[PDB]
Every structure is written in C-alpha cells, then in structure tokens.
Ligand binder design. Structure first.
Ligand SMILES: O=P(O)(O)OC[C@H]1O[C@](O)(COP(=O)(O)O)[C@@H](O)[C@@H]1O
Ligand SMILES: O=C([O-])C(=O)[O-]
Ligand SMILES: O=C([O-])C(=O)[O-]
Ligand SMILES: O=C([O-])C(=O)[O-]
Ligand SMILES: [Mg+2]
Ligand SMILES: [Mg+2]
Lengths: 517, 512, 515, 464
C-alpha cells in the first residue's frame, strides 16, 4: 500500500479522491499544521511544558483575560526554560513561540461565594438579578450576578438575550433599571466565577483596545513575545490601534486578528489586509452568530486567508471533551481533520491544555489527526487553484517559491529547504501548500518562533558563527538542514530535496534539486 | 443573495469557500434526513409528536437493550404520534421505523451489589477478567465477568482491552484459559453491561446470533421499514440478515453498519450486497485509531455517493447536547462536514434516547444540515457525478439526469416525482440536486423508506386511483403543488420540474 | 466504436486529441449547414438539383453583381430544383435563400477582358475624373469612391484585387492620389478596393442596397447577409428597410473590417447572426490576425446562442482542381471545431469548374470534424456559462441535451412553430442531430443557420385532437430518421413537445424507443 | 494588453476564444521553428541570407530530385550564407540541415498488387485513374500513389543507403525518412547511419495508413515525427487528414518528441504574394495543435515569393503562439507526465511554472547536448527558451523543439565554473536584448548546473 494517500492524490476527481482514502495508508512523519496551546494551571510547570513540546506544541498562548503580569512573566520564564532545555542539540531543538492573547472588550461575571473554583446551581425558569453594584463582585449566587460592564442597562432591552460562560447559560431580560436587570433563567446549570458574557443583539460600546490592553501589550513588547492574538477586533482601525501600541520596539511582532462577532466577519477583508494573520475564535463567534452558521465563517475566513497567503488559526472546543476524558469524541476528531482540510495553518487548544486533566493527550491527538488530514489533502486541485488565483507579479522570490513547490510535487521531494533571514521566503513557499515539509534555516530566533504560524514550515535555528566565505556560510545552513531532516526522519541519504537560497549576499532567488547527503 | 448562490457560481472551490456568506439565508426545505434513537427521554407519544415537528424522519430502536415488549410499545407510540398528523395529507410527514440489531457484541457482567452499583478502576491496578458465571452478577475492582466465552483464544499478552466506549483501557499481562489478569491503563467509573472491544483480535462471534434472529423476525412482524445490521464484516454477513428477513421481509432495507477494520477492508462487497451503509463511528473509533475515522467516513460516503446507495454518518455528532442545550463548535462543524461529505442521513444516539435536550438536538441537526446543503459546491459535484456515472441506455436514467440538469438551469422550487417503489425518486437523488424532491406515492412503505435518500421529501397520497391515467397523474401532481406551497418550498409563479410516466416524461411547469 | 466515442471519453483535451482515429467512421448525419454561392457554374435547375443531393442547404445570392432579373431567375431555379423532391416529405430537404448585400463597396474602372501589368515600384495615379472611368491603364486608375482623398492619408495602403495588388499613398492631390506599386500583378476591370486604416464614408445601406433589400422581401428570401456592418446602427438600418413585411427575415451581419471586430458585441446583440467574412477581413486587418477574429467571433456567437458562418476561400483551390489542398481541408475541419454553425463556399460553387465536388468535400470534412468535437468540455462550459433563467423552454432544452449525452440518443426530435425551441437545443451543441418538425416553411428553411438542426416540413393537415397531431408529427420525425439512417428501431431518442394544446411553450421531454 | 494575456486568464476555453484580441500585439520571439525546402528559387547565397533573415531555421534537401553534386553544393551555399552572420555571436542564428529521403517512391511489380477497379493517382493526387477519372496536365516523372495496395518496395533502397551515407559525410543534423510504415523500418535507417551518424536525428515521415496505424512503434523508435500531409492526403481520404494530424501532434506532445506539420501550408504562395484565408488558418491551427515546426516545400523551393512565404509563417506562428490556452495546456501536460524523481525534470517544470508566475522574458538554459533545453520545451512555456551551448550540432538540432532559440557560444571555457556560467548567461542576455525579447529590468529564468553533471539550478534574475 502506498503512503501519504498517494493513490488518492492521483485521482482525477474530488469524488474519486474521497473513494480512495485509505486508513491503512500511513502518513509521513512530518506534521505541517502548527499546534497552539493555551498555558494554565494544568500546563504551567517546566515539567509539563517539556513533554508538551515533545508532544508537538509549537506556540504557547497566554490568555490575558486572567492572571496578573507577574503570573504571565513566570509562565514565559517557564516556557523559555523548558524550550531552552533542548538547546544543547541544535539539530533536535524545536523553537517555541510565545503569544499574547488580549482580554479585549470582554464582559465577565464576579466571584461566586468568594472562590474562583466555587459554583452554584441554577434552575430553569428561575429569576436572577444582574447588578452593577460593586458590593456583590464576590457575592454572586443563584439570585444575584455582578457584571463588570457598567453600560449594560443602556445597550440591552427588555426581552434581550444574555448568555453566560460559553453560551451554556441563557437569560432573557424581563425587567430593566438604572443599575440592575431582572432576568429569567432558561437554561440552568452550574454558574462559576468570572465567566464570559455575550450580548448578541446588542452593540457593545467597549473600547477595542482598552487601557488594560495597552498596558498588557506594552508588557508583551518588554517580554519579547512573538505574536499578539488581539481579541474582539471588528474593523481595520482596531488592528491599527494594536500596531501603534506595539510601536517601533515591536514592529516585528505579528498581529493575529481574532474574529469573534458578526461585524468582524462583515469587515473581514479590510481586517485581513491590515493584519498579519487571522484567528477563527469560534467560542465567542458561536454565541454572537447562530451556531449553525459558524462553519460558514470558518471556511470563508480560511479560504480568504489562503488566497491572501496569510496564516489563519482555527480555535476553541476542537477537543473539548478531552478536558475531562482521555479520548476525544468522533465529532472532535472530525473537526480537527476538517480544519486541516479547510486549509488552516494552525489548530488551537484552550482548556484541553490550560485546565484539563489530559493536556498531553490533547496535544498528541491533535498531532495525529493533523498528520492524517494533511495526507488526505487533494493537492492536485489545491495547488492549481492556488496558482490560478495568484496575482501575476515580477517579484523574483515569489516565482522561486512557486517554482520550488511545483518541483517538489514533480519529484515527490522529501523537504523544501529554505534559507531565510526574516521568514518571508519560507512564508511564500507555504502559501502554495507543498506536501513536503519546509525546513526553514535561520539565525534570527524571532523568525524561527514566528515561522510556526504558517502551515508546513519547520523552523531550525542555526547557532553556528557566520563564515567569511558566503558560499561556505550557505553550505553550512543547507548541511544543517540536511542533518535535521535525517535526524527527524523527514528524508534519508539518496532522497531528493529542494533547496532555496540566494545567489549573491537580498532575496531568495536560487532553486536547487539536490540529493540528500 | 440566498442559498449561497453567489458561492455556487464560483469557478473554483477556493473561491466557493471565500464566498460563503453567513448572511445568505438557506431555503426552507432541508434535504438531509435525521435519524433519531428512541429511548426513555423521547419514548412518550407527546414527546414523539414534538420529535416529528422538530424534524425527525426515522425512528431508531437499539435492540442491544430492552425487551420485545419494550420496543413494541415504542413502535406503537411512534405510529400514534406519526398518525396524529394523518388527518391532513398535505402536512403529514411519513416516519420510518428502523431496527438496530445487537450483533456480535461483548458486554461485561453486573457489578456486585445494586443494579446501579458502579466501581472505580484506578490507573496502575490489576483486574482479572473471568468467564466463571459465578461473578456474572458479582463484578468489582478485582474481578470482572464477560459474555465472550472465546476471549482466551484470540487475545494474547500485550493486547489492549477496551470497556465503556474505550473510556476504560486494559492491558493483559498474563493470560490463561480461565483467568486474564490485566493492567488498568486509563480507568474510571466502571458500570454494568458495558460494551467491550478487542481491536487487535479476530472475534469469531456469529454475525447473526440466536438473539439476532428472533429480533429480526420480530421486526418483520412489527412491519419495520429498515434494519441496521451491526458489525457487518463481509458480504456473507449481509446475506445472512437477508436470509433471516426472508420472503416476508424482502422489502425491508438492510443498512450495513461498518464498525471494524474488516468491514472497512471489505467495504466494496458489503456495499454491493446491502441497501445502504452506516458509518458507525462509535465502535469504529475504538476498533481503528481515532485519528483515522474521518478517512473511513469520507471514503464510505464517497463510495456510497458513487454507487447511489444511502449512507448514514452516526454517533456523537452532537454528544455534548446530552447534558447541555447547545453543542460545541466541533459538533456543529461535525454535522456540517458530514452533510458536505455527501451523507444521505445524520443520526442522534443518546442526544435523543437519554439526553436532557432531545428536541434541541433534532432542531440543531435540522438547522446545520439545511445550512450545509446550501454551501455544497453543486457545480463540481454534478460534473463529477455525471462524468463518473456508468454509461447506460436506460431511458429512466436519462430522464432523471435531465430533470436535475433542468432544475439547475432554472433554479426550480422542487422536482416532483411520481413513483410507486421509489426507484424514480432515488434515481434523481443520486445526482444530488439543490432543489427538493417531492416524491408522491401511494405506497406507505415507499414513503417511509424514501427518507434514506438525500433531498427526497416523501408525501403520501391516499386518493383512490382514477380510471383515466392522465386524470390520476394530474391529481398526484396537484397534490405535490399544494404540499410545496403549504410547506413554503415554492410559490405561485415559481417553476418546478415534474417527473411522470417506466418514468420517461419530464416537464417544466409554473406553479399554479 | 464509431463517431470518435473513445476520444470523446477522454478526461483531458490532450488525450482526446491522442485518441482521434481515422478508422473510426462518423455517423450519417452532418450537423454543419452548407451555404453555396450560386453563379454561372451552378444556376441551372439540373446542377442545382445535384447541389441539394450533395449537401447544399442555403443558396447565397451575391448582389455585388447581377441585376434583379438575373437573381430572380436564380431563385426560380433554386425553388424548381428544391421542389423537385417535394413529392416525399420524408426525404424532402428544405433549401434556404440568402441575399448577400452589395454594401459600401469600392470598385475600380474599366481597362473587353483587357488586363494591365502593374510593376513593383512604379507610379500609379488614382483619379476621380469620370472621364477616365472607361480609360483605366497602367498609369491612371479611376475609382467610384468620390471621397477617398478625404479619408486616406500619406503612407496609407490601398489594395485593388482581393488584396492581390498593393499600393502605398505617396502624395495627396487636390482630387487625386499619387501611389507607388508595392505588389504588382494583373489588373482587371471593376475590381474591389480596400482601405484598411481609413474611416470609409460610404452609407451603410445605400440606395441600391435599399432596393436590393426590398427585392429580398418581395422574393420571400429567408435571410440577408449584410455586408460591411460596422456598428449596431447599421443593423437597425437594415432592419428598418426590411420593415414589417420582412420582420421574420434573419439579418446576418458580415464582419469584414476592423471597426466591425472592435464593435462586435453591439453588432451581435442587434443581429440575428454573424458571418466571418474572411475575404475583405483578411485585407482590412493583417492576414495573420484573421484566425484570432474568426475564433473570437465564433466563440462569442456560441456563447450568445446565435448562428455564425465561416466563409471565403475555404476550398479556394477547388475552383480549378478536383481536390482541395491540405490547408483547405484543415481549415474546414477547424471551422467546425471552432464552433461554426455553417460553412460557406463562394466561388468554388458560383464559377469554379468543380462545384459539386466542393459541396461533397465540405459535407465530408464537416461530418468528420463533428465527431472529433470534445463534447465533454464544450457542454460543461456552455452549461457553466449559461445565464440562469426561469424560462421553461430553456430548462427543457438543456435537459434534453443532457439526456441525449447520458443515453447516446440517436436524435433529439423537437416540434416547433417558429424554430425557437429547436434553436434553444442547438445552442448547447448536442452530438445527436436535432430533427425539427414544423408546418412553417420559413422556419424550416431558416433552421439551416443553426448547427445540428435537421428541418423537416410536415404537409399533413392539422388534426382535430391535439394529441393525434403531436403523435403525427413525432412519427413523421421517426420515419425521417429511419429513412436517413439516423437511427433504427430500438434506438433511443428524445422528444420535445408541449403539454396542452395552446400552452405556448415547449415543456415536455420524453425518452422513447424508436418505432 | 499584449501576448493575449487577457485571454490567457480565462477560466474556460470558450471564454479564452471570446477574449482573442486582434489588437493585442504578440511578443517579438517566435517559438515555432520554420523548415524550408531549398530549390531553384532559394539556392543562391544571396537569397539564402535573406531567407535566414526572414526566419528560416532548418534547410530541407529533398533527395527525390537532383544528384549528390547538386545537394552537396546546396549545403555549401547554406553554410556560406549561415556563416556570413558568424562575425557577431549575438546576432548569429544557427541553421540546421535536413535530408529528406526519396524512399519507396513510384514515379511515371505494379501489375501484381492492383486489381480491376483499383485507383491510381498521379502528380499531387491531381490525376485520377481506374484500372481516366480526373484528367489534367501530366508532367514527367511525377509521383504516383496506390492507396488500397500494399506496395512491396524496400523501406530503405540502395539509393537511400547511398543517400544516407552521403548525409553522414556532409554532417547533416537530421534525416526526414519518407514513407515510414513500421518500427523495423526506422531501425533500418539507424543501421545505415551506423556509429558515424549516431547523433543524427531521424524524423520519421508518416505518409500512409500503416504509418498511422503503427504510429506508436514509430514514435518510440524515432527521434521525431513529420505529418507529411501530401502523400497522406492521397493514401487516406482528404477529409481524414486533420484527424491524423491532431492525433500525431498530440501523441508527440505527450511523448515529448518533436513533430513537424508539413506540405501545402501556404501552397497558393507559390504564385501569389499573399496566402489564402484557409492557408493562414492552417498554419495558425497547426501551431495551436502543438506542432514544434511548420514546413514549406514548394513555397520556398520553386515558388515566386519564397521570402514572403517565410515571413508569413513567422507572422502567423507568432500570432498563434499567443493564442495558445497555456492555462489548460500546462496543467494537462503536468497531470499526464509520468511521475519521476529526476532532478532535471523537476528543475525544468519548476522553471516553466516560475516563468508563468512572473511572465518571464525568457528561459535561459545552459546545456551541452540540448537535453535540459528539450525538457523545458516539453512543458511548453510561453517565454522563449534561449539555449546557450558550445556544441554547434546541438545548436542546429535545437530548432526541432518549440520555443528553443539556440545561441552558439564561442568564448573559451573559464577556469572557475561560476565565471563560465556568468559568461554564458550574460551572452544570453545580450542576445535577448539585441533581438527585442526583453530589456534591462525585465525578469528571466536561468537554468544551470550546481557543480562543475545534471542541470539542477534555477535562478530568477533581473536583466542587467
Ligand atoms: O416556440 P416554438 O419553438 O415555435 O414551439 C411551438 C407542439 O404543440 P402545437 O404545435 O400544437 O402548439
Ligand atoms: O477568544 C477565543 O479564543 C474564543 O472566543 O474562542
Ligand atoms: O464579402 C465577403 O463575403 C468576404 O469579404 O468574405
Ligand atoms: O513527402 C512529403 O513531405 C509529403 O508527402 O508531404
Ligand atoms: Mg483573551
Ligand atoms: Mg456582397
């Protein structure tokens, strides 16, 4: 039996491509889809972080909706300690990126009985009074809930719907007031502490980048984070507000815009052009818009991101049951596989790794599903379509990238080795979605960390000193990439690989089809 | 724009995705059938009436549990709620009845103590699986009885044993002809009569057991519309089910359930022998690695679409809705991608049998499937189905593919097909048109069995046969006109396709 | 297998080419209409009879020459030869009459069959003095375009005999032109003249054209080939001249210059059809660009569902020889493969020595080319590019063609009054021949403009029961296909009819076995 | 826009036709080679010089007429005219020499192969006979065709053996083998050429039904194919020739072997200064079919306007090359290409893909034998392939492939391979600039090796 679903790859129709998908055809060793994991109490120790990197974590996500600046600074220190514990072997060292997820214009409840882990049961048809009196921030119960959004009574109306936690608890405003709302519980359950609140039909007037967000962003600039997941972005000027706060010191920090509402979907095109990447944050999105329409927004945003060549992240509840169970549901396995088939550069875990009981199992399961799904990609149709929709340009590097991907398909290349300084040449290869893994050799540690945003880029950080002869320096990094693929099992001596370098000390314009040793 | 028609005109699948519009409302008609498992939560006539209104098309009865007395009351309640809408044939919705056989299953004994007595299995503990029937009703943390008497002949040291949907995992360390000491790998609250899986073993249990025979015969007496045959491994298994149904139940459809590696490997011969396929991801996710299930699902749905047989994607599609009133983002995506794969039917098993939100589950499947039907890249699917269609001289196939083509060119409100056995309407559903298929029939069984096919909206006509054949056809056609008008599928001045008669007449007619 | 069905099953156009089999015989039916120019070599009733037997469907009358009496006799002979087969409606082939306009032509003077040798590099003076009209020589030349000096410039090119003689304008006199011969040759009398880069100021419809068009309305012509159409307003002038009496006369606009190509879209919308008139076009634009205009116009006509004619010099060597050249054989096949509804002969039939051999050769090539069409790709593209509409006939038509591919129908039988339902089927280009049954003799004749339509004229009286009248005409189409070899009983065909007497639209499709 | 780039972006072939623009000017480079038959009208050194200036790439010598001294002289005039431009290596265009064999010809055991009622055709099918049907003017020593008969004449006669060895001694670049009917016939030609002429390309001419029926054996055994429509149009029905032409051109494109469309492409230009509309369509459609080369045989040997015929083919081929639906053609050639791990094929297809992405002005290929240039032309790029070589034979033989513009580098080999590469690459830059293919600032694709022997390096560089 052939491997990597190569029999399905030869199908002349997408229907026959489906008919040839073989569970007995093993995939390749390399996994092209990046894995972003949210760090929390269940994954903050250096010990867990080490195994998580070994399990397939590429980006550590820090959710600034919780915790103080000292809490996150320790998380960053632990991430770097666990990551650098493998730095002794540059061939096996896997770079790990650090991502700052902003709180954003969030609405959160108060503390229930005074404990963040405490909870209180709610019943259907019961009455719960929402208050803005700060005398009940930590005195929330089954009858009084405190909110942090002071202007709620001016944006919701009688008969409006209010959702708590992840849309699980629903409330309808029956009575209004100056600083209180009397709502009826429809969908009862356990109400916890500091849970998220959504007002779908309302136009929340909270700042896209609040003062806390500005302070949190400056903290990220000082901690040398690699990217920013900016929450509740609904327009391009919001993306710009984040970039100005990052200022000159953080020019190279990637801004990933999170689409979590209808306006963000409506204004997606202007948002995508202004951002470095997009996150389909299905948690809030699944509450702001009807649940049955979320898959339309996901496939649309991933499609437009592939067309523009910018990274897109599918996130939230991909393996939600693994928070309490060691194995996912069949729906969860399909969701991860379908996200990769959609064309998502990265898949995310947020809860399965931050607080769940099986954080390692969740990361390995994502690694396994993404690997199987990448082989099931209909590369024949995907590559030609990406070719037909690519604007014609006289940029020599873009021609080198598409020429490398085409050559990698013709000879079934073991890898595409790209020597890059900023990552751009490597990104231009990933935009055409080659089957072969992209080994991006760089001396810049930031671009090595940021390379995980693009599908298929395996960044390797060269710590060897710069040779005086440029041809020797190039040959060093290529040989460095050769040893990485050999040691990681991507290729072996005698296999064929594509090598992307420059010809003279500017941009990658040289393409070589070389044997491995 | 509506029906995602701006995306439907894209010349590339990538642009078809880019044009998916959450503000583009779908049509009223919902093409994908919804099969619901009946249990304590949805067994009552009053709840069953709401189930039909919520969008339920097929009632599924899991014979792995319950007596014949229990299921006969379920079937009695299903027909009572269904026939309570029979006073209006325009609005009457036919509901099929499906029997899910137990099959070659492996289940644990009753834990010691109460019937609800559960035990706890801790990771790093030992457990001795036994056949001694003395512990059949005396299971605990140390001993555990199984109903598979040949387990010691197919398993060896180092193999894995799964209990309770693979949530509990065991590793056998020392094997004997009577005892099997094992090491708990995961662990959890272990209950009674829980299913057991042996992935690396070749279980030699009968495909159609003694209990399966009496259940199948019982299904024939209860006039069931279809049978779901569990753990079908080879085409010879399908023939055994057909043999039991015999002459009395020759018209009952056999939907083979693929649940193991052997069934996937022999899917071609199983599909040829069966009337349909159920991708039963529950056991399949335990018999083969979980990360490979989506390959088997997309393979089986594709091959069934290629063969024109109905395929069902099942199990845990909206699992979190058992306890919660809203699904997860992965579950909403799982339903949509199942419909985008090409699945004729989607199923609920626990979300409707024992869950706290059975009507919400059905309602959610209705919303996602209708939304996913409009997002189907009909342009590429039709071309590929035509190209890959086996060449025939059958006049009925040329008429069927002509009606679907004509339904695209004019974006018809529906395709009205007059049929007795349903084969005419099935030949239209094979090419997967966007417009709904209003299949008018007088055969009650045909109207119930029609739910297995995508897009077929069956309507039962109880009018007597007129002497003049042209008089009778015009009545059935007008009965379909009033149905599509009442259900909001089309309106006066809209254009629909009519298929009459072998079926050889195709008409484009404005709605009166 | 036959009709290149192995090449038709190819999944790529390259493999479709690789499977083209010279040993795969085509079907009996020929879908491309053949238009033949009548002249001294083909005007007799006897010769016209053999032309119909050889495959002639439309008779073209070139009104650049001949008087109204000469042409009236031609039509009488055409109708005499055509009606000589009227005794058997099963084998009767309708024949159309087409009037080719004189148009804004420029013609030289008179030099008694006298010929003058023009030498390269010599000086040739073009004058407008009507005193040199009958005295044309190697030194002085007279034209009938009295406004030539105001539209041509110094350095412009002038062509004098179907592009054979080339001239370059060196000086611009008060009422004359001083040119330099570039491509010399034998200069005759009253030869056509082309001014490529100039904006000719001649009326689109001249006084002679008005009378010749009125003559066409009175002689009951089926179509008009309107010469040198350059804009939509020209087509309207032709439509207004035809008036109410000739409202149903199809106007085929002839594209013969750059402006006609540049403004093609406005011309096509206003016309009933298009002719790629490559004679003048090959002189007004560079010859190497003509195939670009030909394939563009044929493509846009296929997209709009309007008839297109490829014309001029398709078998030019057959004027003097009994066999065509390899370039001529390829040209006809490529015109059919491009998507042309009709192919034309103009000279190979009017004055050549082998008029019948030219008609049979077009019939043979068109039949072979029709089988080599990549119907798989063509139908898919025509399907994807077809505007979505709620017209019941359009849905029925595309459904019939789809069904004919699914079952390899032997034919598509269409019952039509005006021809529209048959035209709507032909626009999707089915492989099977379309048998259009009609009682209207004009729609039977005009149907030859559309590819694949085999018109048959039913002379039986209208039955009182509509179902009997439908069954009569359908059975008539069955006997026609049987006698002509389109199918044998047991074959499958598609039948397009109405549903009620007086529905007003073709809405019923039946896949029936052949009687 | 230019080069029919608006029509190139169409998503369907029908829309590609609808967008063909007579006002969209083509590029300067002409990719289709032009083969001209030399005769009394084109043998002078003066005329041959103008013939090269008009666009002639291959000189064809028809050994059906003339003695060895006539043909030996003709080669001398061709080489004299060709080398008259050798003083400037940037403007020198190599010219190939082709030997067209007489073959098993019949000209005015016949009684043992025909029967009563059989057809006999004389001249170019102009006179018909039944054992007179189509009368006419009969000349001396005219060709005769027996369509339904199985002629038992030797595939390679004694005259052919002596004529083929004569080609080996005159250093011809290729042989046009007439009336090839089987693979064993092609092998007979290779044996006569022997070891001394192993590198002489054999182009098999398909002129009868058996040749079409046995086409697959002939393509595998030959270096190239000629659709010789003259004899083919008499042996098989005239209306069926376009089927054989499109079949043979397709199978050659699939196999990556050169194919020549020949005979009567501009036949009326023997006596007239302008072609017919059918002739213009024939040349353009042959290029659209995928023909590597187009031929003239009579329009250049004896006609009154040999130069005008060469320029007209040059103009039509350039116009037709822009009208090719490259989008579908490249995708189909890619999907139908056997999967291989050969770095040169991966390098070649990557260069063609990159040339489409940046609309490159040229694809510069540094090659010794021509293989790397041939592998690029098989994927049919829109951009011209400038093949830089030091081998003079491969420069002449490169004209058989569509799009290859050969340039002969006479500069000495530099010691550092990087300097030799930079020398030859800049040589290609000066050639394309001097010919108007590109200008400074344009982008081109450069194909070289990586070490001082497979071509594996591709560079996307601006024109200096
Ligand atoms: O619209 P069209 O093509 O003229 O068809 C009429 C068919 O039935 P009738 O000819 O009696 O109307
Ligand atoms: O913020 C998020 O990640 C979300 O809403 O899922
Ligand atoms: O006048 C014409 O018909 C032409 O130019 O072909
Ligand atoms: O001999 C030839 O070249 C021909 O017949 O075309
Ligand atoms: Mg956050
Ligand atoms: Mg005229």
């Amino acid at each position: 039996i052939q491997t990597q679903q190569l029999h399905a790859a030869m199908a002349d129709t997408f229907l026959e491509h489906m008919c040839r998908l073989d569970i007995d055809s093993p995939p390749i060793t390399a996994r092209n889809t990046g894995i972003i994991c949210t760090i929390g109490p269940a994954s903050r120790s250096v010990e867990t972080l080490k195994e998580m990197i070994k399990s397939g974590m590429n980006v550590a996500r820090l959710n600034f909706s919780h915790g103080t600046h000292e809490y996150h600074a320790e998380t960053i220190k632990n991430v770097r300690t666990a990551t650098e514990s493998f730095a002794s072997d540059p061939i096996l060292y896997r770079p790990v990126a650090v991502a700052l997820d902003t709180k954003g214009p969030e609405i959160r409840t108060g503390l229930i009985k005074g404990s963040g882990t405490a909870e209180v049961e709610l019943k259907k048809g019961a009455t719960l009074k929402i208050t803005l009196d700060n005398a009940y921030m930590e005195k929330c119960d089954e009858n009084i809930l405190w909110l942090d959004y002071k202007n709620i009574c001016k944006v919701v109306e009688v008969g409006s719907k209010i959702y708590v936690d992840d849309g699980l608890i629903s409330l309808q405003v029956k009575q209004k007031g100056a600083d209180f709302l009397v709502t009826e519980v429809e969908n009862g359950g356990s109400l916890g502490s500091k849970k998220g609140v959504n007002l779908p039909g309302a136009a929340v007037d909270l700042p896209a980048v609040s003062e806390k967000d500005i302070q949190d962003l400056k903290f990220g600039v000082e901690q040398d984070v690699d990217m920013v997941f900016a929450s509740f972005i609904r327009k391009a000027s919001d993306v710009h507000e984040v970039r100005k706060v990052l200022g000159e010191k953080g020019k190279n920090i990637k801004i990933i815009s999170k689409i979590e509402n209808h306006e963000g979907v409506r204004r997606f095109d202007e948002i995508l052009e202004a951002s470095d990447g997009i996150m389909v944050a299905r948690g809030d999105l699944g509450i702001e818009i009807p649940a049955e329409k979320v898959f339309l927004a996901q496939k649309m945003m991933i499609g437009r991101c592939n067309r523009a060549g910018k990274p897109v992240i599918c996130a939230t509840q991909m393996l939600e049951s693994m928070i309490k169970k060691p194995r996912p549901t069949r729906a969860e396995g399909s969701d991860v596989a379908n996200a990769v088939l959609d064309g998502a550069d990265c898949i995310m875990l947020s809860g399965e790794t931050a607080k769940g009981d099986y954080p390692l199992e969740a990361v390995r399961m994502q690694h396994l599903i993404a690997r199987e799904a990448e082989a099931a990609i209909y590369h024949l149709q995907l590559f030609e379509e990406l070719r037909r929709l690519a604007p014609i340009t006289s940029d020599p590097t873009e021609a080198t990238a598409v020429g490398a991907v085409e050559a990698s398909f013709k000879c079934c290349s073991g890898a595409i080795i790209v020597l890059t300084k900023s990552g751009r040449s490597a990104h231009q290869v990933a935009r055409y979605r080659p089957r072969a893994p992209i080994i991006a050799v760089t001396r810049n540690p930031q671009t090595a960390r940021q390379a995980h945003l693009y599908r298929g880029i395996f960044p390797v950080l060269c710590k060897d000193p710069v040779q005086e002869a440029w041809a020797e320096d190039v040959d060093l990094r290529v040989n460095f990439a050769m040893n990485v693929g050999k040691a990681r099992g991507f290729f072996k001596k005698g296999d064929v690989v594509i090598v992307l370098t420059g010809w003279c000390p500017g941009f990658t314009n040289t393409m070589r089809v070389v044997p491995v040793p």
